[PDB]
């Protein structure tokens, strides 16, 4: 049974990984973008045509963060470190007692610097930040995930 | 032993008398409901136990109260007969208390066993006199049988207060005060 | 089509764990039913020599 | 008295048997008899696993 | 304020400090008074239910100080796979879950204590004993350990029976945590038939004895008719 | 009990999966699990080759 | 890597056989020179000694580097940090070996 | 023929079952059709079909 | 009695027909069983197609 | 984090009222520096409401 | 003092170099200046001309 418990953890893991390499994507994407939109003679009008694709490309971060669910269990929003329960995801690995691991996790659109909208005029109350640092956070966003795919990646090998 | 019942006894007087008093302010409500609760606004009448509802509820005439509690039938029923005419004033945010002539009050459903007997209907007819006033009060029992309190055997005359009469008195002071401060 | 790539490998983990909750690995079954089915054999064969007694 | 022979015989009778419900199906879990919670919860992830599809 | 307002912030903060989580002054001082009615009452069924409680209090004393010890030793360890924000909060999950499952064992134990300390008090059959302030003393400190090791842990359905039992003995019924913590614990089963969605009838019964409680308790820390009561009486309508 | 040729059956039986989730997509990497730093990298140099682009 | 080593501690700890902890540090001696003697023969003095033990104390327990960390360690020497790891494998391939060697005496 | 009834518990408890894995092959069903209803772009008129299922 | 395999042995011959019916039209919907609406809807483009044709 | 006083009679401190015109001030000012002006009138509002904060002509 | 507020210089320095968490830039840049300001007390005696010197740039 505890090799059962083993194999069944693997496949959470994957699951929490699918969302995560959505998630990845969606930062290439949106840096992308961010790198069209850093260019100084692309306009403030054709920027918002941008920010339409990125605002929804964040809503959709946060949405995976939100609904992925395996077992009914929430692996991505912020019930990490703590909901109204710490009850995380435990693994019993070994037959008896201290043979243990637990598996905590945390994304949502607040996991980087979310910038949305871009200096000038907007019909939104937000913009965007340093061009620099605009590539900087997406740089620290993909840091981020990607780290934290890492630690789903080798924890699969450990089981 | 009997210096314990003799203490309990006192505190259940002032229990039904302090209550009483709080029952005497309920002349707020003739100028003036929670769930499953209905008030009737009267005057004494038949024989001076029971309380006709008037016709004009608002009248400045009415001297009784009567609050029917339903619940799931009819659970409890009070009428609260006042001494005096109420102030002439139409604002009920302005009225007084007036002592009590009588509270008469019946219990149909959770009917309370003293010594394995129900009574059905209690009848106070001092109630704002002397806390001490087990004289005043008949209970009517159901196995309805007239006894007077003051010659209850006393634990029986103790479990008649604590159980019966002065939860009915806190549960109608609760109602009427729900009622008035709705409307005030 | 974005989204269809991470609907996809959601698709694919889950019904890795759908295997892997449900589907045994039939080399150790069949191990389980040699073994089985050898001890009702020695079973028979010893009620007929208990018979005997 | 027939020795506990009965009792294994039987009872390796039936383990063979179990072995036949889980190795024609391909499971370890045929049943909620044979995992009641790993029955539930397949059944969880295979309306994933459509829903998502 | 009154002789009574004034008399009642007194025995509040005494009632509050009669419900304080345990701690080893408070062990001494229920000791002391709990032997004191062993004294008066000279019944050997009243002092092996006595044995037994501070054998249950005993085993709640021990387990706070386990509870430290652990954490200082968990504490004291060198971490060198902690680098991950997951891996920290791993180790705090490892603490938590084998803490609280260690003081579920230690209520267990603390409560055959108290059951047997009520069996043996449900041995003194003479109603002249079972009246006398000695044994209504013990068995409501019996009860109230109780409660709180099963507070403690978030069992509130389970403290409903023991405080009922516990305000019906002696004067109880006037103590303002008593009513309290029965507030709170039907307020935690009426959360449960929502959160459930149970049957109406439990959703009902479970609000109007939350409520009886909430009053009770109001009455008896502020008094009727005060600023706080008539805030209270609105709200129930 | 079955003999250690049951762990090989099963492992090699992996790698043979192993090595078609590599070969498929050309690469030793395809995901983090086969090394997740190498991974990262050649994300950061596909933004580099794209923003170049 | 920090991971696997504490997974390293844990099997030390956990390994049992009819609730014997095999592998932590009570081997090759501890109050007594008496370890896991096994009585081969039918007669007395027919008897044999078996002796080990792993913990991640076991090699130079090397973790962490020199830059940002939350741990309170860091690697030495490279080289070393390499020839430490062979001689981790050094040692336990020997106790392996040395259990192997008394599979193959019994 | 304690042993007997205990058995005969047994087919009675069995084929209660079956009618209950009857039951939820169903809900699975309502389930799945469920999700396609709960696209707010299918319509009024092909939700009558799904409820027609 | 034959144990559940002569239940999946009936449902796997079904599901494999099932799969040549879709593989060979090169259709998820063949039949109005398979999906009623995506049926319909299909009726409907392909006159759509073809009065635009 | 001042949001998080509950108690009707903190909240209408002038200790409370101060620092909250103090905190939409440098908000609005912020925002004024680098031309975000639409930015500053909830903010704006919001501070005319505080303390006669209505009768201050910079506002 | 002096080898102390150096050797939290250097890990000041990393975490600036690395761009670490700042409660670690603080704590670091703060153990420094402690042991700065101590060391010049030490050499130097309180409120020196050097003792003043690091009091008013530190603060």
Known sequence: ?159 | ?184 | EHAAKGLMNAYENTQASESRIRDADMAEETVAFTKNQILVQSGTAMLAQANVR | AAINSHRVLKFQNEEVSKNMEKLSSGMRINRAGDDASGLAVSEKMRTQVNGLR | ?237
């Not at chain 1, 194999?7 to 994957?14: K, N, T, V």
């Not at chain 1, 699951?15 to 306009?43: C, K, M, P, V």
Request: aromatic residues 10%; neutral net charge; contains cysteine.
């Open chain 5, 1 to 237: 304020l009154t002789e009574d307002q004034k008399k009642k912030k007194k025995e509040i903060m005494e009632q509050e400090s009669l419900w304080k989580n345990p701690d080893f002054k408070g062990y001494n001082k229920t000791f002391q008074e709990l032997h004191q009615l062993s004294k008066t009452f000279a019944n050997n069924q009243f002092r092996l239910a006595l044995s037994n409680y501070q054998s249950g209090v005993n085993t709640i004393m021990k387990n706070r100080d386990w509870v430290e010890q652990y954490r200082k030793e968990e504490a004291e360890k060198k971490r060198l796979d902690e680098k991950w924000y997951w891996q920290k909060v791993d180790r705090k999950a490892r603490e938590e879950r084998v803490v609280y499952r260690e003081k579920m064992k230690a209520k267990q134990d603390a409560l055959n204590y108290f059951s047997k300390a009520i069996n043996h008090l449900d041995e003194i059959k003479n109603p002249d004993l079972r009246e006398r302030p000695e044994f209504k003393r013990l068995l409501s400190d019996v009860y109230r350990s109780w409660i709180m090791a099963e507070y403690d842990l978030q069992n509130l359905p389970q403290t409903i029976p023991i405080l009922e039992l516990y305000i019906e003995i002696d004067d109880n019924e006037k103590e303002y945590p008593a009513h309290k913590y029965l507030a709170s614990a039907y307020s935690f089963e009426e959360n449960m038939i929502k959160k459930t969605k149970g049957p109406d009838d439990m959703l009902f019964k479970y609000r109007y004895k939350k409520n009886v409680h909430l009053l009770r308790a109001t009455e008896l820390k502020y008094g009727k008719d005060s600023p706080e009561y008539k805030h209270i009486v609105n709200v129930i309508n």
């Open chain 2, 1 to 184: 032993s009997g210096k314990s019942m003799a203490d309990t006894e006192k505190e259940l007087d002032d229990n039904i008398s302090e209550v009483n008093k709080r029952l005497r302010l309920h002349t707020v409500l003739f100028k003036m409901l929670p769930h499953k609760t209905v008030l009737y606004k009267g005057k004494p009448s038949a024989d001076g136990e029971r309380c006709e509802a008037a016709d004009k509820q608002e009248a400045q005439d009415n001297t009784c109260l009567h609050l029917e509690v339903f619940d799931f039938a009819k659970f409890k029923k009070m009428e609260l007969f006042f001494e005096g005419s109420n102030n002439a004033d139409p604002d009920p945010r302005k009225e007084q208390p007036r002592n009590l002539t009588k509270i008469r009050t019946y219990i149909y459903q959770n009917n309370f066993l003293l010594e394995d007997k129900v009574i059905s209907v209690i009848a106070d007819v001092a109630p704002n006199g002397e806390p001490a006033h087990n004289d005043k009060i008949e209970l009517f029992y159901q196995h309805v049988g007239k006894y007077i309190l003051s010659n209850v055997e006393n634990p029986i005359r103790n479990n008649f207060k604590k159980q019966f009469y002065f939860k009915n008195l806190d549960y109608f002071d609760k109602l009427f005060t729900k009622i008035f401060d709705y409307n005030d």
């Open chain 1, 1 to 159: 049974q505890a090799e059962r418990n083993t194999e069944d953890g693997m496949s959470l893991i994957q699951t929490t990984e699918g969302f995560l390499q959505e998630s990845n994507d969606i930062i290439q994407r949106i840096r992308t973008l961010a790198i069209q939109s850093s260019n100084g003679i692309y306009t403030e009008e054709d920027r918002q045509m941008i920010q339409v694709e990125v605002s929804q490309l964040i809503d959709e971060v946060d949405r995976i963060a939100s609904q992925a669910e395996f077992n009914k269990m929430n692996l991505l929003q912020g019930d990490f470190a703590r909901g109204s329960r710490a009850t995380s995801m435990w693994f019993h690995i070994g037959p008896n007692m201290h043979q243990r691991e637990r598996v905590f996790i945390a994304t949502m659109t607040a996991r980087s610097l979310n910038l949305k909208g871009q200096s000038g005029e907007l019909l939104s109350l937000s913009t965007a930040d340093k061009s620099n640092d605009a590539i900087g956070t997406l740089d620290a966003a993909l840091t981020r995930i990607s780290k934290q795919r890492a630690n789903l990646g080798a924890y699969f090998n450990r089981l």
